[PDB]
Amino acid sequence: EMPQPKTFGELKNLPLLNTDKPVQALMKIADELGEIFKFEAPGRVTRYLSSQRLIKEACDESRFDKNLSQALKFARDFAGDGLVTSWTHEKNWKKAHNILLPSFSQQAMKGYHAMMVDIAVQLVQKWERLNADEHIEVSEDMTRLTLDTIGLCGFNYRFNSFYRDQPHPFIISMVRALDEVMNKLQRANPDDPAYDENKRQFQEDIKVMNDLVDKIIADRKARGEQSDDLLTQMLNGKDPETGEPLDDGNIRYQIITFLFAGHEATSGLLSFALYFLVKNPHVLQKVAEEAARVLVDPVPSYKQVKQLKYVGMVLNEALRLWPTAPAFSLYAKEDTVLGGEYPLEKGDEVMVLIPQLHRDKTVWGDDVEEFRPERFENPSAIPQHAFKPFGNGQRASIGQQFALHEATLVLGMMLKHFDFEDHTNYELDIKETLSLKPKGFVVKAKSKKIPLGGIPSPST
Amino acid sequence: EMPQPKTFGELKNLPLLNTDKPVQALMKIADELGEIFKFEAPGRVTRYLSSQRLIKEACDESRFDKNLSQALKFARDFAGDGLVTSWTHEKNWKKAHNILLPSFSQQAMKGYHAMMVDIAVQLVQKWERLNADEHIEVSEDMTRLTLDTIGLCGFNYRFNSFYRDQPHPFIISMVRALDEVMNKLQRANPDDPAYDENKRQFQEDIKVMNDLVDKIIADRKARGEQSDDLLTQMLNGKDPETGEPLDDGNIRYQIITFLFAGHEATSGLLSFALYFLVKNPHVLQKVAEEAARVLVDPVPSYKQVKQLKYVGMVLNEALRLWPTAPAFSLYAKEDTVLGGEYPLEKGDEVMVLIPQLHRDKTVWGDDVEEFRPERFENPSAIPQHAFKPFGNGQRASIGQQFALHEATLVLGMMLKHFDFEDHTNYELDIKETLSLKPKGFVVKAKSKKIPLGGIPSPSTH
Amino acid sequence: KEMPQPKTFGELKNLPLLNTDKPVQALMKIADELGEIFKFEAPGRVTRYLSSQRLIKEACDESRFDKNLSQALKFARDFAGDGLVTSWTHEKNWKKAHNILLPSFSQQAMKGYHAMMVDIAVQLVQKWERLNADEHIEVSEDMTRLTLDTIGLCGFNYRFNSFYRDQPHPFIISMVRALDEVMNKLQRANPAYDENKRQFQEDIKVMNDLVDKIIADRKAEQSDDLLTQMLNGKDPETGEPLDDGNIRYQIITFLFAGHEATSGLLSFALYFLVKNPHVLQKVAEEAARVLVDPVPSYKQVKQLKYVGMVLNEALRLWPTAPAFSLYAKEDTVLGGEYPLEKGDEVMVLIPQLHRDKTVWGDDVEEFRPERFENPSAIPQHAFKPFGNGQRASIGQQFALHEATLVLGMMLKHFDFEDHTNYELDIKETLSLKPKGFVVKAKSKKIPLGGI
């Protein structure tokens, strides 16, 4: 039968995930045990998949469907039946999926671009205005950007994260709420009243999110619709098949969903990308060279951002080593046998462990640990389902091209305007929060003295 | 601040004991961390003492009283407020203890002796009757003996375990009930539906125990009392302090208690004792000689058992290395400070780790891992609180003299009648069930062809 | 000099201290540590708990203070509405119902209730007479059967028939579950929780379904009782009767208040007797002497003086509706040292009042019905199991008559054995009841029913 990691009496495998770095623990277990292993808790079993061979079968949508893991179930407390936390079969999924998909089309992306630039220009300028002693808090600043961008592009709301030294009230609540969700996974006795304090913070944090989301609808029926964005679509889009728009309840869920999904992974990507570049200076130089070659105007155009092909590779290779939404969950639609060896009773759950897929030697070669954006040079070469940072099928990220457009534009501007220094020789430390993010990653920027508008850099 | 083993987030230390050898695990942790360490589980905290100097302070009854371990608290589900599972200040503790204590004194042993011999004879003739290729399964047989022995001596009930090749229906429930107790300890969230089958099985096995017990109690009050034994005392004895006898509810818990406590630990002792003899041939020889020197009659006399001095020393040394009831809990009566450095608030719990106390080199020498009965040649030399296989103070084992008489009788008889071969070269594997017992221990006996009670040895036909 | 106050836990304030299923007994332990008064805070609310006669005397001044709905009572409003228990003094339906309903709870009214009370009491004694020798009694379970059936019949001519059911009546499982839920709301910072409102809602429909059946069938009248008064009675002051919505509320209110506290009292009283044989001997002699006929009369029950004393003395130690709330009508100072602003709440902790030594002596924990021999020698506001003023129990005479007749009959017809050596364990459900109190009853073999 299936291998299984260390067991602990009545608790079975449960205590192994009672750590702050659970995905990383699972990665180490996949290394010991191979492509598939059973994971048991009291009353629950899942199987963890780490090989292209098996993950390919799981990605067959006639045999498997999206499952909501415990984390997604918990997240429903604030995100309800928004796109991320719905079952496929729930009415609001196909309904919302159909209405909002055109908001991440080709034509819609060109419309987000000028606003993306507005936030990116703020980041650059912040770093141009640091004093000589000061360093950069990479992950902190990348989060200021990814939020402000989804806020602005999607809902025409300005969080103004760069006008605040502490993160925005809304984003402190959201992260706390996400942390609480990570915690609930670790609680054997959630009834225990020692968690009453947590239960209270969660409920106040959810109230905060919901007050903003109400203030955002205030801005919009008040605005008199200059704007033409995701919110516009939420409110006025009618489902082709059902002919009705989303009701106000779902709309509130989707706004929250897009604010949480739209910033965190993308923020981890930028941080990791910057981390790999300082640790690989020849790769940094090749990126900086592309940025100077391509970004020849004071602000990047949409077409230019598409031309940054090597930056795209750097981003995909960062997503290869550390996908910032590192696992997703499936369930067998009907009885089925997997890999010709493992029967699954209908309803049984599997877990795609994406970092391990991306380290599967029988598809990426023996090179897997080395950061080499050049693997993505001829895309066609890479087998189907060997690379899945954005999930699978109809339940794949609706936010993919947006994330990649945002990250590419930003990273390109960064390397256009700064050289970077790993002044503390940082040792990688990966915090887990439903996402991966480097923790405590700091760098120093040396300005390349290049103007943003007509306005000169601090060469003044 | 105080040492503490590996932690697991919100589970704290709990998973370190989700093994089926938890006490042995605590011994390893003891060796790494020293004489005191803190142990946390969801919602509780105890501290594990392993040195004579700290334990000696915990055994001061003015400062510390018996605490119900998490194991005993669960045991109440079938043992109620019987003697083992009651708090000192529960009304039925003092009451039962006064009423029953004289039934367990050394004087009282003369009156159990014949019935002990009855069961011991059955063991010897079992082994006398094995075929040549067969072997003895030591723990399994010692359990048969010790259960049947307390059954008969205590309540005049014959389990007839030597008439069965798989244990009495009542035993299997009692063992399963005890396994569920073990498991209950391992759960972070009892009341999780995953455990609902376990809970329905506990209830059934508790019905089985109470079934038998109610039969006995009815058969006695109805069947007019030919015997004079524990149950007689329970039904007729009046507590001097109050003038009140025990109530039928509490009698049912007491019978269960004596059935459960009155065998497992004693069974382990004999099994370990035999193991140490077959691993130490010179000791085995000295024991076999005492046996043949002292046990001159066809069946042992009470006087004779008391003269098996070296056999006694052998048993104490087996208890020193592997005390078969290995831990007990205490709680601080008032605020106090342990060893001049550890403050304890009122009600803070400590655990005595007897296997580690019994290895405290400051108190025993460097010898500690070596099996020498001869340590016990001069009792006076052993320091106070160094040796505590039977617990402490007024909450120490009521069963002490019973156990030692049975084991002394039985081991003396085994060595008179047999030689013993470690034919598999057994590597010690210790099973844990709130007690310690050798697991998978087997030997072959070579009959000495000596008659028992006038019946020719069945190996000499 | 700040008011004493037990430990806080930040934003949850004092609330984690009452995360237990014995919260009143918890409050009692706190009043022992901090004394006659303390602040208690929870998110959004604050009271002060009063334990001394010195203060409670003042809190009972109706010109200075008025009944307050505690949080528990407020939650109860979902099913109890503006019924007599759950309504503010100033709500129109309080004084209105109060005036309409009061006469039908007078001592004179008791004569009329007596025959019905007997029909339930007889059923109790018979159940115990009809046990097989091995069997025992679950005291509080059987007392609830009696108290529920009694208010059902006296109040509404409705037969729950609880002694013909092995298991409690559907209505009363819902009611107990409704109360359990009110209890649980109390220990949540916020009432995520929508999930558990559904069960609460099913239980309230069940309660209402029965009430509506009772009211419809009565409108389509041989009976003359509470529901008759509610339906035909007019308020002298206003000249209008209660409306159908309030009547639904009053019935539910009488069913929940009319059975639980009366039941706890009877269990507690039996508990104190089996624990105090000299007192048991004494009641027994009275019951035997006064209850000369198989079926007791009103006259006879009034003559059970010592039984009455036994009941008050059990209410002293364990008053079964153990607290009530007041608010300050105007700015006032309490005890000449505690300023209170208008609107400020206090909570009378009755069990602690009842243990105040400056008023009761050093004797307070002992069970001594002879305390109540000379009732004029009891200071004012030292004894308050029935609340205070115009917002005091309308049910007080009903309960005591019912408990007096029943306890007297039990002692007439049985001897009782504390066969398990029961150790007191008190369960809270907005009330106090012994939990798992069992006894054995040896019949004195005196007939109730002919041959």
Ligand code: HEM
């Ligand atoms: C590096 C950036 C991102 C990564 C790695 C990422 C990854 C993923 C993954 C793995 C899923 C599927 C989860 C599952 O199977 O349960 C997903 C779903 C989703 N993503 Fe993202 N995402 C990113 C950026 C974004 C952005 C920027 C948005 C929105 C602006 C977004 C919105 C969503 C939504 C709405 C879904 C749910 C879609 C559905 O199942 O119908 N994502 N993403």
Ligand code: HEM
């Ligand atoms: C080698 C054999 C035995 C050992 C090592 C042993 C050990 C112990 C220990 C350590 C305790 C104290 C437990 C604690 O403090 O929580 C104890 C208590 C007890 N033992 Fe034993 N015992 C043995 C034999 C027996 C036998 C044969 C019986 C009955 C027939 C028995 C009955 C009891 C009882 C009733 C208690 C609880 C006494 C009280 O607290 O009043 N024991 N024993």
Ligand code: HEM
């Ligand atoms: C031992 C028996 C009883 C006790 C200890 C008891 C106790 C109390 C207490 C303390 C209050 C006042 C609560 C507050 O001020 O917030 C009260 C009010 C009340 N009681 Fe009782 N009671 C008993 C029996 C009964 C019975 C048998 C009934 C009905 C048949 C009843 C009906 C009521 C009602 C309706 C109120 C509220 C009336 C109003 O405030 O106008 N009680 N009771």
